[PDB]
Amino acid sequence: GIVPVACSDGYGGLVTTDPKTADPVYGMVYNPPRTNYPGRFTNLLDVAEACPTFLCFDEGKPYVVTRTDEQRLLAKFDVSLAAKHMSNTYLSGIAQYYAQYSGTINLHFMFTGSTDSKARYMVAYVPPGVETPPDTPEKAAHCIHAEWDTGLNSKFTFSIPYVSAADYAYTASDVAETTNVQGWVCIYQITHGKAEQDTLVVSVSAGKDFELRLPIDPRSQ
Amino acid sequence: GIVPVACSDGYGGLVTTDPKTADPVYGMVYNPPRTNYPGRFTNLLDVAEACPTFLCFDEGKPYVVTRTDEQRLLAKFDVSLAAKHMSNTYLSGIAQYYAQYSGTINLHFMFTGSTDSKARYMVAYVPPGVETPPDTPEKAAHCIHAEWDTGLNSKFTFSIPYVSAADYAYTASDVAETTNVQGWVCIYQITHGKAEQDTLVVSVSAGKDFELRLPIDPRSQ
Amino acid sequence: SGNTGSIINNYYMQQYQNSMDTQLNDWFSKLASSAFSGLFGALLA
Amino acid sequence: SGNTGSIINNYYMQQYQNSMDTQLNDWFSKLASSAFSGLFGALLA
Amino acid sequence: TTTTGESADPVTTTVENYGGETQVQRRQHTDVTFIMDRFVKIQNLNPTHVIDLMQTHQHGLVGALLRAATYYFSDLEIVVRHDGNLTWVPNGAPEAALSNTGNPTAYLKAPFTRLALPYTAPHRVLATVYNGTSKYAQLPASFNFGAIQATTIHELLVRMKRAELYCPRPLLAVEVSSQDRHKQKIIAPAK
Amino acid sequence: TTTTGESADPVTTTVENYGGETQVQRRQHTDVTFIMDRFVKIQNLNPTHVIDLMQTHQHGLVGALLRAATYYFSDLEIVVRHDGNLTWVPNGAPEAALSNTGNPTAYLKAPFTRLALPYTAPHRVLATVYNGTSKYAQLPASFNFGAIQATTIHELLVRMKRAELYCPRPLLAVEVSSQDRHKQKIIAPAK
Amino acid sequence: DRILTTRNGHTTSTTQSSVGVTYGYSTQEDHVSGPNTSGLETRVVQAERFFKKHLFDWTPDKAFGHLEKLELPTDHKGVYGHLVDSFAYMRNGWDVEVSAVGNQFNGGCLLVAMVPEWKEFTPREKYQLTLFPHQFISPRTNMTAHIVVPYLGVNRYDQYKKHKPWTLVVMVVSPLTTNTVSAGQIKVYANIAPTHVHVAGELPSKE
């Protein structure tokens, strides 16, 4: 006799993400060598950590600037990978293909003023729980925040912390959510000295524990 | 119970080059012995290396000849397994069944003149990069080349080197390529003495590192 | 390697299942690992 | 042997799968290996 | 963290700077080989079709990630729904060869044919962009994985195996006009 | 390299003569057993058909390579698409035997029948050319792999197993009139 | 140490306002002797030296995104240029210095990047040019950017008359600002040296 088998209903159909391999048909192909080809990346997040890309502020500028030397909110944006301000970043370009994330997002601030222009800035992370973001540095001081001034080192980096009820958050934003589920980042100018036409360039990168999970194919095709 | 299996969609069809074997139906057949039958070849390139076959020049002659004792281009041909001049060779007969090759192609020159006829020849490999092949030995001298004269040894062999951008080259030639992708071989007569009716027979064989890969069945059937 | 999870070997030899690489390196991993962290200067914590 | 790449043995015995050879050699390999290379004469390199 | 921004040296600050604690991360889903290893549609088909990964959709998961690399290498699997027998020829073959049985030819077996194919280009890696010409914009004709032919080709899926990507390039999310966030309907239970 | 051409001794010069370096070569694809080991069509069919490899097409990959050898040996696999049951008889059988079930007979099972057959000729090797007569041009009638019969034979593919070839003979590419190169459409990506 | 001297052949460049050297994609070259040149390639050190090119004038009116590019190799009238005409195949990396001399009273910022296989970037893609090997030039900090890249490409050797693997890109990130004590515009120049120059396949003479 031979081996009896049960061909099982519900199994065997092709699934586009299945973990099996096809049968081969053309063997013994040896490839040209590509030993040590430069610029290889094996994980998207290595690239996302190492290469910050620019945020987008009013009028498509990767920077904020202010002409008054008074304290002011220079920018406010949703802590969301779907935020308008993050829409041209590499981090958001990658995140659209995953349903969830957790971990740190790093913001980078680079001052480009002349040597005779000085300023003092503040960045605050405002968690969900208030109706509108604080409009002054004084109200925002009660949040997790950092203040810094300009000098020899033109760059300051700050980690936006992952603080949420659930262990993961959605990368996309739903039509029903009015105020952002993950809070806001507010950037203020405390004051400046002769910095009217000078700018602060802002970029973003993935933090050490930033993580994306659950691959999805969401764009209109 | 018995073993449950998933008969998988997309598998099981016959593929003409599959790596499996059919079920047998007529066993125990012993063959007449054929121990040490002569003339066996196990790789086509052993034959192609050991047995040079003739090139084809104007009017279907396996040789070039010249009546003037002046320096002249005796022949120019494309370094292509699809070249007119190579069309009756065993090397091209084999190469038509593979999509790609790399490695050395060897040219053989055999002088058949009488004892009182002498000549000096030159062969040059002209890589791609110039519009037309050089018409004189002087212009071609700047290329990889060899010069030799006739004497007791009637045969001279020269390796056409594989020099290209990619690691493999196509054996066939496309309708769109005007000047040959791999360059040209130019054969010149530097001068001769009383060699007006005497000929130089040319043949070709595979070099030590010549290689053909990716079997194809291209002829009209 | 990749998105495959059969506990059992492949019925076919590797020379058939895939092309074979020949020889004659993760740049971004090195780049990311090399990033500066911490501060710069003097801390008063 | 040839164009086959199953990692696993054949379910059938060889006496059934193929004919069996009896006894009572690669000429072209020898011929090609025996070819002269290099030059002839005296080199001034 | 404070630094010289102009040097462009990577800097990765952490929440420890203000008293937080960096967590564990598991990045298997953003591993390159893993993410490219799934079937995607090719879409613009003909009975004679040259397999070119650049025909994947530019915003699809695989097509977008592929375009976010300059050079790549991979083996391939294809699923083809076709009428008649399907023949495949390697990179470099004369188009005429597609008519012959001596080339890998799969006899029709419903519902479609799935095959594993090796990389067959003459180059050590392929590119998604090529700044120059190949003749003696577009990509050189030699950037392909062979060609297939059947009486009719209804559908074609490709899957990159053991993919390698080199030299990252821009990858864009949808542009946002909302002024705050791109919002869309996320799946949620009925009633 | 300089030599006596008349002796016809093999001579294989290398690029080292002028300062180059000979590379590594991988010749698996030109291995004889490997290259002959694939299915090809037979084409001129009848309900009663004697299996003769010389009925392969003379320019097909297998047919041309077979004709480029004088003697050969191999076992065989066949794929037959037929109506009715298929019977096979070995080399030497009376044609009448094709009507009986006691000879290997395959009962129809869609879409076709695939079988492994042994070499059954009375000679130690077969030949592709035979300079003489066999009766007391053509090849002796004993040069065959048996015969098959079915109500209708729609298609027949043969595959040489563990092939051995002896004494090479001419193998020709297409003749060229272009005066420079035979040019043809090589596969290239669309648009 | 802000003072750097770079030497390429019998040419040197010294800068007192540098922020270091950025290496792109690798700190060494792939193998220069592969199967495609059959051991016939050779190195030409006489070509490994600095040549110069003016890129553009950075003026206050150029806005964010303004991009200037230089495909390499470019027209070269020296030894390197003769190689392009005398050999069929070549390969080399690049040692690139870009300078933008104004004074410290100017403000603004330029992105200097080396891009493999150039293609015209859309405005949205410009926000991600930092994915490529780069440095910034910002008058308050430096006047010089310095990037070193290896040869790369689908082919181990190239025909530069048909393909240019690398493109030097300079993009305005933040516009140039001026004062009564600043420069009014900044002329941007490139000081470039080909590295590890190898050629193969000598061509016939044109006459």
Numbering used by the authors:
A (entry chain C), B (entry chain C): 1 to 221
C (entry chain D), D (entry chain D): 15 to 38, 65 to 85
E (entry chain A), F (entry chain A): 1 to 136, 156 to 210
G (entry chain B): 12 to 218
What does the paper say about this structure?
FMDV is a non-enveloped single-stranded RNA virus belonging to the family Picornaviridae. The capsid consists of 60 copies each of four structural proteins (VP1–VP4). During assembly a 95 kDa polyprotein (P1) is cleaved by the viral 3C protease to yield VP0 (36 kDa), VP1 (32 kDa) and VP3 (27 kDa) which self-assemble to form the capsid. The structural proteins are arranged in an icosahedral lattice of 12 pentameric building blocks which are the major structural intermediates for FMDV assembly and disassembly.
Initial production of empty capsids utilised infection of mammalian cells (RK13) with recombinant vaccinia viruses that encode a P1–3C expression cassette, where P1 (derived from FMDV A22) is either wild-type (vA22-wt) or carries the H2093C mutation in VP2 (vA22-H2093C). In situ room temperature X-ray crystallography was used to determine the structure of both wild-type and mutant capsids produced using vaccinia virus at 2.2 Å and 2.9 Å resolution respectively. The crystals were essentially isomorphous to those obtained for both A22 virus and A22 natural empty particles, and refinement, using strict 15-fold non-crystallographic symmetry and real space averaging gave reliable maps and models for both structures. Diffraction from crystals for baculovirus expressed particles was indistinguishable, demonstrating that the particles from both expression systems are iso-structural (data not shown). The structures of recombinant A22 empty capsids were very similar to those previously reported for A22 virus and its natural empty particles. However, one region on the surface of the particle showed a significant structural difference: residues 171–181 of the VP3 GH loop adopt essentially identical folds in the two natural particles, whereas in wt and H2093C recombinant particles their structure is more extended and almost identical to that seen in another serotype A virus, A10. We have previously shown that, for serotype O viruses, the VP3 GH loop conformation is modulated by changes in the adjacent VP1 GH loop, so it is possible that one or more amino acid sequence changes occurred in the highly variable disordered VP1 GH loop during native A22 virus replication and account for the repacking of the VP3 loop (no sequence changes were detected in the ordered portions of the native A22 virus capsid). One group received A22-wt and the other A22-H2093C capsids. Two of the four animals immunised with wild-type capsids and three of the four immunised with mutated capsids were fully protected using the criteria described in the European pharmacopeia. Baculovirus expressed wild-type and stabilised capsids produced equivalent titres of neutralising antibodies, following a standard immunisation regimen, over a 34 week period post immunisation.
